[PDB]
Structures are given as C-alpha cells and as structure tokens.
Amino acid sequence: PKAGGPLYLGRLVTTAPVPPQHSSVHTDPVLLDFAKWLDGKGARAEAEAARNAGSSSALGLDLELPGPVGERNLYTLHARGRILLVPATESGLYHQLAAALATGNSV
Amino acid sequence: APAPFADFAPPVRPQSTLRRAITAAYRRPETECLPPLVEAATQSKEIRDAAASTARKLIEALRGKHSGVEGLVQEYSLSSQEGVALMCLAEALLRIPDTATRDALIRDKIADGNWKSHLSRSLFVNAATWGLVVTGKLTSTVNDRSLAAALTRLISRCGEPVIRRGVDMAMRMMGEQFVTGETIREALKRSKELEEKGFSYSYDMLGEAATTAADAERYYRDYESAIHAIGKASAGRGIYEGPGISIKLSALHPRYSRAQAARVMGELLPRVKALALLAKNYDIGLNIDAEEADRLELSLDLLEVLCLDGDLSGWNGMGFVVQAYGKRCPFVLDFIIDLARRSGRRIMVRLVKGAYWDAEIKRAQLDGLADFPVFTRKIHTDVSYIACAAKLLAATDVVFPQFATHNAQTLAAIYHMAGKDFHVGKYEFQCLHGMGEPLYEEVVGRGKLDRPCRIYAPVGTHETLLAYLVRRLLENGANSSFVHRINDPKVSIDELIADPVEVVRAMPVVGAKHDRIALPAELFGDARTNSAGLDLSNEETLASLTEALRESAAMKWTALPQLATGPAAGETRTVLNPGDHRDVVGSVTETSEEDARRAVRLAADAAPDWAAVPPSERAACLDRAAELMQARMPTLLGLIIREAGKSALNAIAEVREAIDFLRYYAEQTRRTLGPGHGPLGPIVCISPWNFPLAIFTGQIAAALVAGNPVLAKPAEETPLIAAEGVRILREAGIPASALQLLPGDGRVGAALVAAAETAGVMFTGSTEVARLIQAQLADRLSPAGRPIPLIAETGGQNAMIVDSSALAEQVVGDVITSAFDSAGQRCSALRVLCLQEDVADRILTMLKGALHELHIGRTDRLSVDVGPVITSEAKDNIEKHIERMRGLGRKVEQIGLASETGVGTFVPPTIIELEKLSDLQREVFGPVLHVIRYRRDDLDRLVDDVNATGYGLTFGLHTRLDETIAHVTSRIKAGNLYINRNIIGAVVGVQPFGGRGLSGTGPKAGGPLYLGRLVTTAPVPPQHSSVHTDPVLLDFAKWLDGKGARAEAEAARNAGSSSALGLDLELPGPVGERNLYTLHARGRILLVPATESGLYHQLAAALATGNSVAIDAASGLQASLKNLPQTVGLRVSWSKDWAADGPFAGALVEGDAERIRAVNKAIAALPGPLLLVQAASSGEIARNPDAYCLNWLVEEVSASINTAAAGGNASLMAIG
Amino acid sequence: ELMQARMPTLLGLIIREAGKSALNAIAEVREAIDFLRYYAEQTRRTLGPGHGPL
Ligand SMILES: Cc1cc2nc3c(=O)[nH]c(=O)nc-3n(C[C@H](O)[C@H](O)[C@H](O)COP(=O)(O)OP(=O)(O)OC[C@H]3O[C@@H](n4cnc5c(N)ncnc54)[C@H](O)[C@@H]3O)c2cc1C
C-alpha cells in the first residue's frame, strides 16, 4: 500500500484494522451476480461471504483529503486489475472469487 | 341526483368577522405583517435596557454553568462517525430487555469483534438522529457502510469499555433526557424534584399523526390513561400549580384535515370532549398542541365547540397553542380571547414560535401557493412572538398566557413587559424537558425572577421518542436557534441580547422576505414562472372555488371537429360524469375518418405559414396560453372533476402541469430553436384520457412551438377538456390551421397516423395501442425516405421497494397516494409494493387500516379521496383481474363502496398480496395495489424481478441506508426514480417524465430532449454535454485506426466527444428535495448495417453512448469486425434471429429507402418494446456526421430524492 | 518534535551528504516529520489489541 496513506500500517500487523474513512457505499455488480449464483446452487456460507465482501469492500471510495488552499487532493480506491487465484478447494475458490470480485477485479 | 358541487366544501360553521380576519392573513405578504407587530412589540427605552440587562444576566448564568456525548467522544478519541455508530450500537443493545443478557452479549460477543454477526434491521436505522446528537448536523440518509467501518474500528480499538460507556450514555439520554420517563408513572415520579422548586409539568405522550383507526384508538386510550395518572398525582393542586397533559389532534383521528372536516367534527370532537371531561373531573390542564399550518383553522372549530359545551363548564384547564411564526397568530389570538370572553373559560394559551418551519416552506413551494403561512426570517418570528405576548398580557383576566421559549432575550422582554405585579395564575413560562431547565432554574423561585415555568415533558419508549426526535432537536439545534447560539463561542452575549423589535424596525424594508427563500412562483427564477395552485385549506378559496365550480357545471361544454376550415359535422353524443352517469357534462361531435384525412391535408397546406412564425413568437403563444389557463383554472377544475373522475387536488395538479408544459416548452424553445431546426410537418398528437388536459396540452404545445401544425386527437373519454385546451391555445394566438381538434375514438387516431402527410406522431397511451401505431408507421416513409418519428409514452408496472429502515407511516402515506390517487389511473401509479419480510406484516396492517379511511365517491365533494374509473369497460377489466387473483387464492383487501357509487363506475381501492412478481402479466390501470415480500439478501434478485417485467416507468425506494440506495438505483432500469417519497411526481422540468422498455421510446416529456425530436435537425439542448468519453468507444477508435479506417476512427472520436452520456445535473426545484437528471446508455442497440463504413459509423454512435449492440448477421459484414479488442467484443454480438436476441433499446439502420422500409417492418414485428429506430442511407452517413443522432441513443433518468424525509431540512437549518 | 527543532542541523547534513539544495533538504526533513506524525495519528485512530505485530 501507499506510504503516507491510510492502508500502510495495516500491512505491518497480522490483522489489518479498518482505516479511517475506509468504506464505500458501492457494491460491485459482478459480485452481486456471483452471490445470487452461489445461493442458486445452495452454497449458503459462500453466498454470505460474498455479500459480506461486497459490503466491506472499499472499492469506489472517493475522498478529498485536507490540504492547502488552491489545490484539490483526491484519494480513490479502484480495482487492482486481474488477480491470480490459486485455489485448492471449491469453497476456497468461491471465497477467493468473492474477495476479488467485490473489489472490482477480474481473475 | 345531487346538483354538481352543491356540497363541495361547506365550512363547519359560518365564518365570523374574527374567523375571517384569520383566514385573510393566511399568506399575507411579510412586509404587510411586520409593521403592526413592531408597533405592538415596542417598549420603553427603560424597559428595553432592563430587558437587555436581565437577558445578559440569564445568558451569563447559562454560559457559566455549561457534554455527555462530547465527553465520551473525547475520552475515546472518537471520530464523528464513530460516535454516531457507537450510539446506534448502544440503541440496539438497549432493545435487548434483560440486562444480564445484554451485558453477556457485550462482554462475550460484541467486544470480541463480530458485532454484525450478533446484531433483519440495520444497526444504523436511526443514525440520522444520532448524527444530530453527535455532530449537530442533519444528514437525511445514513452512510451505513461508513458507520459499519467506524463501529468495527472503534470496537477493535477500544473494546468493551467504550461499548459500556455508549450503552450507559444512550440509556440515560433515551430514558431521562429526551423523555421525562418511559411511562407516565415514571415521569410523574421524576417530576417531584422540580415541582418542589416551583416548576409545573405538562406531559406529552408523544402520539402524533394516526394512520389508522386503531392508531387513533391507541393514542386515545394512552391519553385517557395518562389523564388518570396525572389527575391522581395532581391531587387537587389545580390547573396552575398542578400538572396537565398536552394532546395532538392528529393523534386522535387518521383523517384530521380540512378535507375531512365533517368526520373531524363528528368523530374527533367527541373524543377530545371525553378526554376534556376527564381532565375537568381531576381539574388538570388539557392543552391542544399546534401542528401544521393547514390544521390551524380546523382546530379552532374544535376549540370553539369545546369552549361552548356546557358539559365542560366550571373548568379552566382547556389550553391551546398558537404559533408566532405564523402570519395569522395575532388574529388567532384575537379570536381566542374573544372566545374566552364569550364562553367565560379562561383559556390557557401557549404561545410558541413553531415547530414545522422547514416543512411549511417546502409544502407552500410544492403547492405553488401565493406565499408562505409562516415568516421566512427568524427575527420576524421573534417580533411576532413579542407582539403577541403584548396582546396576551393585556388579556390576563380572560386568558392564561403561557410563554414557551428557550430564548433568554424573548424571556427577558416578556418578563419586563409583564411588570412587577404577579401572582400564580396570571401567566407562566414554559420550556421543554431536558433542554429548558438550565435557563429556567435562573427564573423560577424567589431567589431568581420568581416566575413559574411549566415543563413540557415527553413520555414514551425508545421507539416512540425516536420517531420525531429530529424535528424536536432542530427546534433548538439549528444555526438560528438560541440554544445552538448560546453554545457557540463565536456568538457574543451582545449578539444574543440584541432586541429583534428594534432591529426589524431599523431595517431598510420592514418585513422583507428572506433573500435565500424563493416564493413558490419563483422556484425557477428567470427561466419561467411556476404555475400557481390553490389552497384547499383556505376558506376564502373554498368559497370562491365552490361558486366557480358550480358555474362550470352550468356551462354547455362541447367538443367538435375543429378543422382549419371551421367546425365540422359528425356523430354527436353526450359525455357523462364517470362518477354518476346522470350528470351530463357536455356533448362531443366525433370526427369522420374522411374529415380526419382532410384535416391532415389542411395541416400540410398550412405547414409553411406556421413554420414561418418565428420560434420566439410561437413560444409567446404558449406563454399566453399558460396565462389563460392559470386565470381559468377554477373553471377548468370543474370540467376535469366531472369529465375525468378527478378530485379537486388532482384537477389542480392537472391544470398546473398543463401550464408548466406550456411555459417549459416556450422557454426551451427560446433557448434552442433557430432557422436550421426545421419542423417535421404535420404532427398527430394522440393523448390518453387519464391526464386529459396536461398530457394533451404538453404534446400539442411541444409540436406547435417546434413549428409543426398539429392534429390533436384526444381520448374518446375526455374530449371536453381537450376542446377547451384547444380553445385556449387558439385564443392565445395559435392559428386554426396550425391546431385542429379531432375528437373521436381510436379509428380517428389511426386514420390520422395513416395519412400520407403525417410527418410525426406523438402518442401517450397504452403499450398495446402504441404497438398498433408502430405497425401502421412501419409501412410509411417520409418524402425523404426516412421513418416517421414516433414518440410513444406507454404503460408502467411500477414498483416501490421498502426496507426495514423505512418509516412505516411515511411509507403508508406514499403508498396510499401512489397506488390509489385518481383510482390508480395514473401511468406512474404504484402497482407492486415490495416489503422487506421483517416489516411486511406491520406495514401491511397499517396500509390496510389507512385504506379503510378513504372516501370513494363522485368527486365534486372535497371529502372524496378516490373517484371513479373512467368507463364500465375499464371497471370490467379491473374487476376481471381482481377476481382472477382472488380465484388463485391471493388475499384481497377491498374498501366497501357506498350505495351512491351505483350510479357511476367505481372500483374500490384494492390490495392484493402476491407470491411472486411473475404473478402479474400486464398493467392493470386501476386502484389495485399488489404486495410482495422479500428477504433482505434477495434484494438484488427482487430488483431483477422488477426489471424483468419489461416496463420501466416509475420506481420508488423507501430506505434510510445509502448502501441500499446506491445498490437499488444502480440496478433498477426505470425512467423516473423516487427516493423516500411517492412515485407520482412528474413536475415539468424538475422530474422530466418518461420511461423505457415497454414504458416508452422517449425522449421524456417535460425534459430538454423533447423538442429536438419534433424538428428535422435536433438543436443542442441547454446544459446538454458531457466531459466523459466512453472507454469502449475509445478502444474502438484505436482499433479502427489500427485497421487503417482513419476517417471512421476520427468519426468515432467525434462521437465520443459529442455524446452526452454521463451528463449528471441537479434541476432547480423545491427545498427539501434533490431532483437529478442523468443520461445513461439505452442498452442493446440493434444495428442493421449495409456497408462496412456504415457499420463502423453505427458502432461508433452506439458505443459512444454507452450501449452494447446486436449486429444483423444477414448483413454479411462479420469480416469487417475481426480482432476486436476484448472490451469492444464484450459489447458486440451478432444476431441472426432478431426476435430471439432482444429486447433492444433502439436501432440504427443503413440502407436505401426500400431497405429502410423493410427493416422498419421487421423491427416493428419484434416482440416487446417499441424501438426508437434511426435510419440513414450510405450516402447520408458519408455526408452527415450526425446522420445518426446521439440524442436518441442515450436514456434519460430522473431521480427525485426527498431530503426532508429524516424529519427536517439540513440546508434550511442555515436559513434564518 | 526533535527533528523539527533540529531541522537546521539536519539540513546541513543532508545538503552535504546527499547533494540536496537547502529547499529540498527542508522538504526532506519536513516529510520525515510528517511521516512520524501521520503514522502516530493513524495508529491512534486504528490499532488495538487484536492488531498484533508481524
Ligand atoms: C413547552 C413548549 C411547547 C411547545 N409546543 C409547540 C406546539 O404544540 N406546536 C409547535 O408548532 N411548536 C411548539 N413549541 C415550539 C417549538 O417546538 C420550538 O421549541 C420553538 O419554536 C423554538 O422557539 P424558541 O423561542 O425556544 O427558540 P428560538 O431559537 O428563539 O427560536 C427558534 C424558532 O424560530 C423559528 N424560526 C427559525 N428560523 C426561522 C425563519 N428563517 N423564519 C421564520 N421563523 C424561523 C422557528 O419557529 C424556530 O423553532 C413548543 C415549545 C415549548 C418550549
């Protein structure tokens, strides 16, 4: 994560905290479709994990940070891109997909 | 048969001179109200100096002893969101009744981490209220994802100790500060301490706005039980030293309104009398709280009867609030003082400023009324208060003044005005529990000012107090509020002791309106004049309207085929009132199909002369017609009421909308139309019966002002109001050759559509009829060989989604209005209410109770809520649907209809509980609400189900949660969205109206793309641009360049810039609402190319506007799209069977004239929605970069958000 | 606080050791100060007993 930004310290502990202002009201639509698919096939725990990832993902965060006058300093969270998934089990793959899709990524 | 309007709105009693002086002041200009108040409030310099000294002394004491939430935030270093989230958690933990159970959950589960796992209802439902507590700011909706993050963060950082402190803080605030006690017995026990010091109490059981008979009965028995407890405790102390009760009339009847005055006097009055008799027996005060401005005068009729009722004689405890922020206040006081004299009852008069200011501003703006019923500058209310106190202090022998205020300046002014002679019973002050005591502990007692104060003491549970805590907090928490200012270190004591009387007196214009609050007529500023409504709570208006309505029923209304040559002969029949077929409204002569064809030829002949009238002068005709409709509104109301089954309220809205269409299209014309925007030619305007003036006028006005002569074919059910609208337009200067009225049925419409000179068709009506028109036009091409433009605005299957965070009373009101107003005969009407499972039973019970309070009948009575259905065939079709549902086992709730309905065609408001949304097939255009339930996790599936009908007109969402708003509004596909309000809004230029799919082709009526469809070359609408470029368009342009298609790549880049996809505007409108207008992709566009270059141009146009495409595989052009970037490939499909691959949202066609005609026929044959097709020849694509117009490849979406839904208006908190 | 008070001395070292101009040496010391204070505040906003170190 970026130095001098709010995700940095969370990389240096074994369980990351929720950084200040780190949330988003947006839910990735592909995540939503994935959760419905999981519930369709009865993968209830996985569908729940998918919905939880969709909500807790901060994808779409778009903040203006305090700074000097005459400047607008913006901070936004976007998808990483394409995530390599190396699952071992079906449930593991569903959980990996949930995490990656909820954050806007392809896999 | 009762004479029309003979019983429209008779007053409860003849209006006395004193009552008429009240009504006369209802909306009096503010500059007229203030001077007499300044005079009445003037005091001697010696008194003003002494008052300022007393005020300063009180304020110095207040600031010298001046934290619970603040201390908690400080101790744990909480952010604002953390503080709010903590209080929401504490509130939720306090819903756990057993204390040991709650503490165990905290210590073992909540503190350990997963608070979400242990706590169907968002923790943050009431976060707007806690936000006001923590931050002093009101945010209408809740950022529940921010709060969830903050709660996780604070618990993981601070653990059980912060939770414990939050729970204890919330417990104290909700149990001891916002209420005196949870029950009347608890409140009475806690009142002894301050009573011993000289305070008294008035208990507020917190009941308000009954929605059902059962609610009203519950509030009644709560008041009755409280009176017993208060009276037992009073123990003979009497009405001044002893405690009393305060009641709200709206709690005691579900239809407490002037429209239902007869029910109020018959049903509410005896209940108040029964409570008053009990208060009399215990000799306690019983105060009637003051509510909205439109209830003031009605409440006076109850006060009058009660004070004259001999059964209540001997008791002086009847009390009544008057609101000094209201322009009628001094005249109301004159009335009350006189009533006290006549009755011999020493009425207890509580003078307040007023609690509903924001809402009164919004309501007057929404209703288009002449002015506000309240002041708009806070200092005006202060002067009003002091002037009214002077009136009350001169009448202490006949009334008992009660000065309710937390403002030390106000208090000091009155303390000195009242003088040195005092005894208990002369007057008192009043304050709110848990707010006013710091001030009044400097007032009560021989060691202070030795004046008594009565504490208004809310009593109730956490659920009851949270319901309207937002309104109560804004009373003393807005930037203009004294209590806010006393806590602001930037506000000096000198500023707080400023004398409002002398400040107002020295102003350059005494009593000027607030600069930042628009009068309703001025909502749109320089753009146009807002239409004006009528105040159906104003007795002068009701009396004048009664006469105008009666006079309208004596007119010989006719509708004739008004050809350019003059009225034509034809088959004549009467037009009967749908609510009573014995009431003949007028006569219509219908147009022969031969005369319809002749009218089109005359329109074609006259087209050049009308096109030559400059756009500014055409717009001037529209503006003159608007003025004429505004002046004629009362007569137009009467016709609409009797011809179309509309109530007066709905007829007012109908005429206002027509006025607004005229003025909006006139202004849009002045902004856009020039010599190069040539008219299409004769336009056939076919309109529905259900908005028989507004939509009729809108289509015709748009076509005319765009320079086209019009053939106006009104619905066969409602020709009379259409004929009158044509008469008005002709009077306004539209030549007879430019506007021909052709009454008759669908045959006349079809004959007009089929006429060779018809250059465009504007249709509003059913989807099935639009499909027939679509088929007719697929045979036809313009003389230039292009499709005849069709605007087809059609039916809806409109849903409202309600989650467990919504306020049930608000939901039910918006549902009753949206589903059953006009007997559901609005295209926007709510058809499917979707209730989250956890709240569905409670809301359904409330909804059914509210349903049974509706009055169904002939609409020439103000008391009628729901009128008839338009015809017996409409009735038969609706009832066939109801019986089919009933036959399937579905639960069906129906109002019982009065016997008087037998003379008309009525269907009772009906609620049908469905299992699945798939249970509905087509639009049922009547008073039939369907109810489905959903589990929260299935919300996304539910939105899919709503979209799956194929309709897309109106949609509502009731929720407080930003995550749910973002999710639902991003996934729903409808043209008009409404958040936390009803779904029937179509305010021209504010909610541009029109849907997608089976609901419309667009462009939206009342929006900025409309006129451009009615000319051959569309202008650039005002504000119509976007800085955003579709990224797939960009990828396609690079691909074109890589293929060597340099000219097409340039055209693609130009399309990317020219596209207005991504436009996102806020439209000016009333306070307390945000009205948004955005341009989105339409969806999947069918491309029917002929050449490779044509395909590239079609794809550029479609991609630049955000769409995907299905390309006709029969074009053989597959090899032209080899090696597309994956981003573009995702948007591109090839279709061999167009009917299998839809629904499409539009089409682009390339070919010669006969190819276009053949394709147009094939497109019309596709199932489902009508497609907005644009066609061009290959040569046209080469010559004209705008061969395909990007205006018609985006979809307009309007969203109206009620930002006052949390209980107040944040932006108006800064307007004083 | 110590780096802020000692900035003039730190500047001299940075100027001579790393080839920085005075303005850029000031920016260097300011950035170190800001990192210190920023991570201190971010810690005060977030870290609790369950956020164990690596
Ligand atoms: C015991 C008690 C009982 C009450 N009962 C009722 C009741 O039954 N019905 C009712 O409506 N109110 C009632 N009120 C009053 C209302 O609830 C507020 O408390 C009161 O209006 C605030 O006035 P204040 O003098 O305490 O404060 P102030 O800060 O002096 O005045 C604030 C008031 O100014 C007014 N105001 C604010 N901005 C503007 C503006 N831009 N233009 C014009 N006016 C403005 C509003 O009335 C606002 O509440 C009661 C108040 C008390 C203390």
Ligand SMILES: NC(=O)c1ccc[n+]([C@@H]2O[C@H](COP(=O)([O-])OP(=O)(O)OC[C@H]3O[C@@H](n4cnc5c(N)ncnc54)[C@H](O)[C@@H]3O)[C@@H](O)[C@H]2O)c1
């Ligand atoms: N989308 C909107 O803005 C909007 C607004 C109001 C009403 N509507 C819809 O209108 C419908 C109710 O109005 P209605 O009952 O008058 O509709 P309708 O379809 O019955 O009639 C509409 C008009 O079309 C005419 N007509 C009928 N058959 C025709 C034909 N074969 N060819 C040409 N014209 C023909 C009628 O005479 C009438 O003037 C509802 O479905 C409602 O949802 C839509």
Ligand SMILES: [Mg+2]
């Ligand atoms: Mg019809």
